[PDB]
Design a protein around this nucleic acid. Structure first.
Lengths: 121, 87, 150, 97, 25, 81, 129, 216, 96, 206
RNA sequence: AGGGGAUCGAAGAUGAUCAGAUACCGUCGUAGUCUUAACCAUAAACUAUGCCGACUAGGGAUCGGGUGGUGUUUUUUUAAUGACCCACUCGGCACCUUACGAGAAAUCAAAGUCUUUGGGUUCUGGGGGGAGUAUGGUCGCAAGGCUGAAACUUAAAGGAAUUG
RNA sequence: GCGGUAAUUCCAGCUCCAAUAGCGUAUAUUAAAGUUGUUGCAGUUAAAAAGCUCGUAGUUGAACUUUGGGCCCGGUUGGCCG
């Protein structure tokens, strides 16, 4: 019930997405920057805006968010996505084959350096 | 109908399917027109020359459009071993 | 089909496309013809003669290794029974069921099956009289059936 | 109005099935249309389990239970909440929880 | 009303009419 | 499946299909040229013989018919025809 | 059990045409079936058909083009005069310039246009359009 | 301002797609009515029935007017639109937008001899909506349009002056009857003839080369 | 087979079936049974003649509340009694 | 009429065999697919790698024939394919959709997430059914990375592959990207294999 | 008209209820279930879906029968078999894809292949009542069954969803 | 369906319609009626599939028999022709 209205929710989302670099983590300067960047008709409403803004930034700092954050989120997504596991170890070095594994390539006519290794039962 | 003494008539001859040869209606919003390019000895999709296969909504909703496209491409030479006629 | 039932089962032989095959046996058609006449004199109905020949010797079909049919050659040679095999077996079934009804009149299922069997008997007799293999006025009777079955 | 595709029972190609009636009211229901349930019951319903364990001559037993076949009426099953009144869309749920 | 009891009532009426007609002729 | 070669089916497909359901119906049976040990008694037998046939020598039945194909004796030399 | 083999064959043709399939297998390939197929081929309505001659009755395998909307059989074969064929062609075909209702007459098997031109009538079998 | 947001709309802005026949050939789904009214300005809009419909709510009935209206140009193209609105004017406007979006071409043929301009339908056609089915068959030249008044008016807007109609079912349901007529018109365009058996191939359309100059 | 026979020699059966099923229509049944000629009190005539007997003040059926004030007429050709409505406003004193 | 340079090569064959895409669905299969040949006991359903590559090159040809990569759009909802569609969007235009596909995208010209794509690529129809029905509504072609047990309904080009394997799905997505880039002009060295490898198509848990 | 008539159980003998219980719910109990001479022929006798034929939507474990498998374990392992699995079936009982098919809709592998209307046949219906009521005719010992109206009356009766 | 004290419906005064010396009413019959259905109706729930089966009349009832080719000409065609 302490959760606020969807109108003020959208106001906070739009403010964050439009002036993310301007605002900072500190809550007091968050209020004193929101009051001058956004026209709000209620001091209580602007207080709730800034409170949810600092709450969402705290969640961002400790917790991942999908798309409602800044483009620096996309930047860090592309930096962490292209992060190789140290070296290309285990890559194809294990090629071992079997009966069916031979059979397919022999049927398709594309010979491969296969080695027949089935279960020794 | 077709008149000998000119008189260009029957405006907007409908576009006709290539899978089951049936007709494609005026507002059948499922009919697709696959536009696949031609490669000419250079590994390049040279612009301005493609071949078209029209697939109708009936074939789409039946779900054999895949096999129909394979057989059409193989008959046209676009594909080699997708579909064997002797099923 | 299944005239007197509700089943729709299909269980029939599949004669091959062969017309005169394999034509490998050195014993001519005289040998198979004597085989059938000897067995008919021995006293088997043509269905039994045919199945016994087929499973004993190598015969594609009596039709294709002779010039005529089994019943055709039996009729020409005079070994044909007084009544056809189908009617004979139908009458045998009818007399067996009739004796069962006499022993246990309370068997309504057997009474129903009896009516069903006599229906087939009468229809087949009508067909035979129409095609003139059997003489006219020949009728099936519960009395004369006991004489005809033996 | 055909409210049920199976006609509210389990009988296709069977003609007639001898019924066994309900134990609470015995209202007219054939055995296939019945709500026969495999009722499973513990001896103490996990209430005097410590007393059972302490007073058993041989401790740490498997402690089996009672299985019975309750033949339940449709009206009585609804009244005692054996069966739930479900919506038209999910009335076709064959697999029970 | 119930058609079963309508049928019962009409059967009783038919029986009464039959008895009356039998006694009258 | 909209376009299919009904002219010529594959051998595996025809074998999978029922014998009466093929393009031209053909029997699923064959001839078993069979022989008992000792004397030759060379006689070809139907696969679905339906009879307990035996050679004229003595009690040497070569078939014990079942619902479908007929069981053979212990030692029988048989060849497909 | 099997009253009109031509009707069964034409129903199979209609089912294949509505499904979109490009080929049909037809049992048991009567000669009137073959003549109907020949007329369809002459008018360019069915495509191709091949007669597999198994010894029992024969089978017809048909390579279809989607040019065919639906064919039908008119049972029984009504005994029709010239005005009667006029009525039938006014009743069974979408228009006057296209569509061919077919009838057996003394001059072989032909559609209504050819029957009119030869000035002879017969018994109506079916229609193609 | 107009500024439609759709590839069709932007192509019409550019003027690359210049023909209603061209849009109907590729059956590209239409999303606006300004495109239609600019492409075929010779259209006439007439309504026949606006009907009140009542939703009984825990206190009273909420009445919304359902409007069915057919609009098109007097040569070859008409469409129908159904919509329920609070006001008569709003219902008419919603019917107009829906019908202009649902405009369809008509295959007009000759009863025979192909002498002059088309006067009837090409092939006998059926259209079934709910229970009422309406079939149109080609009349000979001069007879007129034989139909119930609503279908008759639809045919006058259609422009074919000679047709016979046979109706079965509850034709007094005007909405279903008009929709059945619409499906019948669609089917009589969708029928097949040797004139359509004629040379089809129709190679690559300029759609790919005219798809490059769109905003997005 | 759509029920009804579809043979070239079934004209007799179709005619008989139509003849038997025609009796389900009220108009054909009444016309061929002559009920209007005998059972109807006008004798199968458009108009009849009679003698007024008395006045009837039968009431209307719901939802309505009025008196129609018809008359009782004994016909001349057959003598049957009927109740005849007096239509207009104040024709009772004329048809007393 | 092809110059016969697009045929299967030992390197790609070994890559496919290593990622085990030759194993498709379980013994249950869809009757519309002749891709499976001689599938052996134990459920092994062997997929035809040659047919897979032919479908792959056909799909590459279609998306190279489409002139506008911005108009080309890919759909994916499974976690095993979201990374793949983002890699595709990095490699070329192929404007993708991540996570759930919001209904009313290709239709509903007034919504903010409205796309109009000239063609749709889907990874798993069983999870991305909404996309194929919207494509059927807005009459656009669609390639589907179908399995041997997939609803091929409303699908133009069916890729014979496996949807239970992350390695297989990433490998086929990479070959899609590589083939389209090669046919477009990004990779002109036909003899030399490409810069990366499909080990990009993955996901580190930490 | 006989045999069991033990027990329950149309009819019939009690109370919180009553302005009324001769109704539900206590107990008891006649007629009443297997069977000689047999009748009766009705049921929501229902799949409210005639029968015989031909082609068609993820489709499996299946019920009876047949075929093939380094096929699985054993009996008497390596010399039959039975049971199981994996495939192909032929025949019979059931269903959820927003079905392209049909239907007014529930819904339907048939209720599809029917306005693009015709595979062969049998039976039944023509608004609701009166009324399954007949003066009649047949069967039955009876109860009753089959056949079966009309006069007159009525603007509705009804089916399938959808809003509380 | 209207009329129970603002009745556009009853009675009456101005206007309009079928028609013009012709219109209104009653009873039949035809189209309407694909509610008699051969064309061409319905039978799961709107009325309707006999409780089930057998069977005479009646209706209907695999396929095949000269399917096939060459030349000439009494006769047509807005005719590759004014």
């Amino acid at each position: 019930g302490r959760v606020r209205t969807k109108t003020v929710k959208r106001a906070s989302k739009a403010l964050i997405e439009r002036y993310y670099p301007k605002l900072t983590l500190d809550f007091q300067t968050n209020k004193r920057l929101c009051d001058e960047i956004a026209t709000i008709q209620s001091k209580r409403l602007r207080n709730k805006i800034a409170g949810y803004t600092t709450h969402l930034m705290k969640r961002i700092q400790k917790g991942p968010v999908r798309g409602i954050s800044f483009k620096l989120q996309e930047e860090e997504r592309e930096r962490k996505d292209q992060y190789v596991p140290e070296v290309s170890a285990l890559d194809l070095s294990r090629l071992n084959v079997d009966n069916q594994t031979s059979d397919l390539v022999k049927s398709l006519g594309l010979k491969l350096p296969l080695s027949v290794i089935n279960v020794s039962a | 109908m077709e008149n000998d003494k000119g008189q260009l008539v029957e405006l907007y001859v409908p576009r006709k399917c290539s899978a089951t040869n049936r007709i494609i209606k005026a507002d059948d919003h499922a009919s697709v027109q696959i536009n696949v390019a031609k490669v000419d000895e250079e590994g390049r999709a040279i612009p301005g020359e493609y071949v078209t296969y029209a697939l109708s909504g009936y074939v789409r909703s039946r779900g054999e459009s895949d096999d129909s496209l394979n057989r059409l491409a193989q008959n046209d030479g676009l594909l080699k071993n997708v579909w064997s006629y002797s099923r | 089909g299944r005239m007197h039932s509700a089943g729709k089962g299909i269980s029939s032989s599949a004669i091959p496309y062969s017309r005169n095959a394999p034509a490998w046996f050195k014993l001519s058609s005289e040998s198979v013809i004597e085989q059938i006449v000897k067995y008919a004199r021995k006293g088997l109905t043509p269905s039994q003669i045919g199945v016994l020949l087929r499973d004993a010797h190598g015969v594609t079909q009596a039709r294709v290794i002779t010039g005529n049919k089994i019943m055709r050659i039996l009729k020409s040679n005079g070994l044909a029974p007084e009544i056809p095999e189908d009617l004979y077996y139908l009458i045998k079934k009818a007399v067996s069921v009739r004796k069962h009804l006499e022993r246990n009149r309370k068997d309504k299922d057997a009474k129903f099956r009896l009516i069903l069997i006599e229906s087939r008997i009468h229809r087949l007799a009508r067909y035979y009289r129409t095609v003139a293999v059997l003489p006219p006025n020949w009728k099936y009777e519960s009395a004369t059936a006991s004489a005809l079955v033996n | 109005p055909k409210k049920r595709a199976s006609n509210g029972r389990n009988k296709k190609g069977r003609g007639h099935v001898k019924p066994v009636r309900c134990v609470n009211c015995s209202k007219s229901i054939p055995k296939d249309k019945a709500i026969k349930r495999m009722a499973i019951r513990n001896i103490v319903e996990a209430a005097a389990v410590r007393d059972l364990s302490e007073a058993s001559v041989y401790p740490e037993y498997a402690l089996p239970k009672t299985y019975n076949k309750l033949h339940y009426c449709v009206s009585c099953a609804i009244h005692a909440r054996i069966v739930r009144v479900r919506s038209r869309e999910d009335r076709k749920n064959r697999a029970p929880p | 009303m119930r058609a079963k009891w309508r049928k019962k009532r009409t059967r009783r009426l038919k029986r009464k009419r039959r008895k009356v007609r039998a006694r009258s002729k | 499946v909209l376009v299919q070669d009904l002219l010529h089916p594959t051998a595996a497909s025809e074998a999978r299909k029922h014998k009466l359901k093929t393009l031209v119906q053909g029997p699923r049976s064959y001839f078993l040229d069979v022989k008992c040990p000792g004397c030759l008694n060379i006689t070809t037998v139907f696969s679905h013989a339906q009879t307990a046939v035996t050679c004229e020598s003595c009690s040497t039945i070569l078939c014990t018919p079942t619902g479908g194909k007929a069981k053979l004796s212990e030692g029988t030399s048989f060849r497909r025809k | 059990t099997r009253s009109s083999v031509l009707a069964d064959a034409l129903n199979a043709i209609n089912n294949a045409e509505k499904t979109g399939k490009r080929q049909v297998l037809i049992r048991p390939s009567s000669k009137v079936i073959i003549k109907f197929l020949q007329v369809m081929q002459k008018h360019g309505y069915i495509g191709e058909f091949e007669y597999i001659d198994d010894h029992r009755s024969g089978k017809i395998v048909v390579q279809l083009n989607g040019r065919l909307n639906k064919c039908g059989v008119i049972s029984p074969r009504f005994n029709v005069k010239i005005g009667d064929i006029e009525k039938w062609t006014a009743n069974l075909l979408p228009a006057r310039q296209f569509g061919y209702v077919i009838l057996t007459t003394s001059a072989g098997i032909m559609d209504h246009e050819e029957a009119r031109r030869k000035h002879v009538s017969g018994k109506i079998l079916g229609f193609v359009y | 301002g107009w500024v439609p947001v759709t590839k069709l709309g932007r192509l019409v802005k550019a003027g690359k797609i210049t023909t209603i026949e061209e849009i109907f050939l590729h059956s590209l789904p239409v999303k606006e009515f300004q495109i239609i009214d600019t492409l075929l300005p010779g259209l006439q809009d007439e309504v026949m029935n606006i009907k009140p419909v009542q939703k009984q709510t825990r206190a009273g009935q909420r009445t919304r007017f359902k409007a069915v209206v057919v609009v098109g140009d007097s040569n070859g193209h008409v469409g129908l639109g159904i919509k329920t609105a609070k006001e008569v004017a709003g219902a008419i406007r919603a019917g107009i937008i829906i019908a202009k979006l649902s405009v369809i071409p008509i295959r007009r043929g000759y009863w025979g001899t192909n002498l002059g301009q088309p006067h009837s339908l090409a092939t006998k056609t059926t259209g079934k909506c709910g229970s009422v089915t309406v079939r149109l068959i080609p009349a000979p030249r001069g007879s007129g349009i034989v139909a119930s008044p609503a279908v008759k008016k639809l045919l006058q807007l259609a422009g074919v002056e000679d047709v016979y109609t046979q109706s079965n079912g509850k034709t007094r349901t005007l909405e279903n009857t008009l929709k059945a007529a619409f499906v019948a018109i669609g089917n009589t365009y969708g029928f097949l003839t040797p004139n359509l058996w004629a040379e089809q191939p129709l190679p690559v359309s300029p759609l790919d080369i005219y798809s490059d100059e769109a905003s997005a | 087979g759509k029920g009804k026979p579809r043979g070239l020699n079934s004209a007799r059966k179709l005619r008989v079936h139509r003849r038997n099923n025609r009796w389900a229509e009220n108009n054909y049944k009444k016309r061929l049974l002559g009920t209007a000629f005998k059972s109807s009190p006008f004798g199968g005539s458009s108009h009849a003649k009679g003698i007024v007997l008395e006045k009837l003040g039968i009431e209307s059926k719901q939802p309505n509340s009025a008196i129609r004030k018809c008359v009782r007429v004994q016909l001349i050709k057959n003598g049957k009694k009927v109740t005849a409505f007096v239509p207009n406003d104040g024709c009772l004193n004329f048809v007393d | 009429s092809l110059p016969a340079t697009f045929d299967l090569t030992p390197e790609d064959a070994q890559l496919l065999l290593a990622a085990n895409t030759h194993l498709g669905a379980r013994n249950v299969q869809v009757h519309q697919e002749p891709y499976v040949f001689n599938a052996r006991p134990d459920g092994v359903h062997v997929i035809n790698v040659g047919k897979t590559w032919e479908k792959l090159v056909l799909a590459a040809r279609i998306i190279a024939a489409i002139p506008n990569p911005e108009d080309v759009v890919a759909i994916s909802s499974r976690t095993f394919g979201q990374r793949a569609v983002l890699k595709f969007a990095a490699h070329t235009g192929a404007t993708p959709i991540a996570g759930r596909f919001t209904p009313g995208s290709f239709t509903n010209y007034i919504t903010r997430s409205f796309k109009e794509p000239r063609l749709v690529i889907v990874t798993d129809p069983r999870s991305d059914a909404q996309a194929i029905k919207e494509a059927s509504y807005v009459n656009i072609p669609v390639i589907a990375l179908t399995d041997l047990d997939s609803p091929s309904e409303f699908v133009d080009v069916a890729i014979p592959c496996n949807n239970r394997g992350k390695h297989s799905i990433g490998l086929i997505w990479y070959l899609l990207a590589r083939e389209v880039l090669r046919l477009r002009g990004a990779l002109v060295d036909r003899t030399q294999p490409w810069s990366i490898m499909p080990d990009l198509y993955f996901y580190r848990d930490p």
